[PDB]
Design a protein around this nucleic acid. Structure first.
Length: 177
RNA sequence: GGGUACGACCAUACUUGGCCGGUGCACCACAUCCCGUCCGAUUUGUGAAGUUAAGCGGCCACAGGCCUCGUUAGUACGGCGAUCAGUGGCGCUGGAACCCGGGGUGCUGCAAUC
């Protein structure tokens, strides 16, 4: 399916004051289902880092970021996450995908299973595309070879839904349902 | 600008130890009387020889304290929420203190006065 997580870049600042007349603007890449969550995660880091809070700031740009292309490539996602079982595991897993958004959402499902880690426990720390060689991880390294061929072994080929059937004659594909 | 009296706030004006120095302030002289003590030390009355030593006030403390703001720290804790997880995160939110550091170390009022 298309990626779970859209790629937002939320930009914002603490709102101007005589206390801080010309406040720093903050860019912040997020991978969120939708902007309202990206805007939220953005204000999470604003208070967890800048001590500025949602009441006192103002997002200047919620906009989603355009995909680099569509060619299959290779992503080093850097993903801190939390648990009672582990309170802050920095962890640069690599994923092979067509987009930063896809590598990242792929990193959430991966991270949610190997670690019972919800979206809001996780925080992406960056998602570089990587060249073939830099990927130390051995799993996706199997897919680098320009000459890689593999079988689609032991397929379950379900019929197109329009054609699916409950009962069929045994060495035939006459329907009987 | 300072001094006096009476002050308001009552340490930024406090404690310590320095140094600094025209009205007055002070210390200072004596106690006859008013008046009071074991004692004129205190207090009281009467003075004006002496001196600023002190008090006083002002300036200095890698002074302490106090005040102020930052750091701490979106930390601690907290309110609300979940068919959350197994105390904790999370979502919406409010949000310190100790500490350390920068600064600071009284200010205003009436009255007569140099």
């Amino acid at each position: 399916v298309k990626p779970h997580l859209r790629h937002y870049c939320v930009v914002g600042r603490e709102t101007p004051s005589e206390k801080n007349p010309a406040p720093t603007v903050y860019k912040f890449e997020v991978f969120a289902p939708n902007f309202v969550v990206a805007k939220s995660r953005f204000w999470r880091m604003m208070r967890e880092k800048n001590k500025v809070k949602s009441t006192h700031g103002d997002v200047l740009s919620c906009k989603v970021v355009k995909d680099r292309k569509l060619a299959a490539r290779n992503y080093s996602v850097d993903i801190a996450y939390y648990s009672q079982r582990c309170g802050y595991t920095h962890m640069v897993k690599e994923f092979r995908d067509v987009s930063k958004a896809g590598a990242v959402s792929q990193a959430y499902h991966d991270l949610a299973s190997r670690h019972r880690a919800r979206y809001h426990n996780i925080e992406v720390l960056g998602v570089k595309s990587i060249p073939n060689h830099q990927v130390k991880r051995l799993s996706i390294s199997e897919y680098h070879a320009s000459n890689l061929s593999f079988p689609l072994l032991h397929r379950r080929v379900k019929a197109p839904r329009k054609d699916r059937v409950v009962f069929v004659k045994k060495n035939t594909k006459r329907a009987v349902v």
